[PDB]
């Protein structure tokens, strides 16, 4: 279901937004979970360009520059 | 109610007819004002999912 599918997210910065923050931060901290951003919500939170829109050019360009030469 | 309002707005409604219309009115306002919130919640769930 939608409310359940929303629960699944890789980015913990995103999860800490609409989910229970107190639990998300712990549950992520133990696993040493490393958030790569990628998605929208996290990028809005951190205050950098949206990886959609006009931003797609940037993020893509960077995303490919990453994990590369 | 098995006794419908036999009068309309152009003619005058009387005390009973109006008093009986009142409940429908308030339920209308309350319901819509609530469905605003429900709609909002739905959009929220939706954008969170996508």
């Amino acid at each position: 279901g939608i409310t359940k599918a929303s629960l699944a997210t890789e980015s913990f910065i995103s999860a800490a937004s609409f989910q229970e923050t107190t639990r998300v931060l712990t549950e992520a901290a133990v696993a040493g979970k490393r958030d790569e951003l990628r998605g929208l919500k996290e990028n809005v939170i951190v205050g950098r360009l949206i990886p959609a829109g006009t931003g797609y050019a940037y993020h893509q360009d960077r995303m490919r520059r990453r994990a590369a030469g | 109610i098995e006794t419908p309002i036999t009068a309309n707005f152009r003619e005058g409604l009387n005390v009973l007819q109006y008093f009986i219309s009142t409940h429908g009115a308030r339920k209308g306002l309350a319901d819509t004002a609530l469905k605003t919130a429900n709609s909002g919640y739905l959009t929220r769930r939706l954008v969170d999912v996508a």
């Binding site: 279901g1 939608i2 409310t3 359940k4 | 469905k35 429900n38 709609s39 739905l42 769930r45 939706l46």
Partner: peptide
């Protein structure tokens, strides 16, 4: 039933109250 709750129920995938079986 119907209405906006019906939509919510659909998107939530919720099993109805008195369902059939296939």
């Amino acid at each position: 039933t119907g209405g906006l709750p019906r939509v919510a129920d659909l998107f939530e995938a919720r099993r109805p109250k008195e369902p059939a079986i296939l």
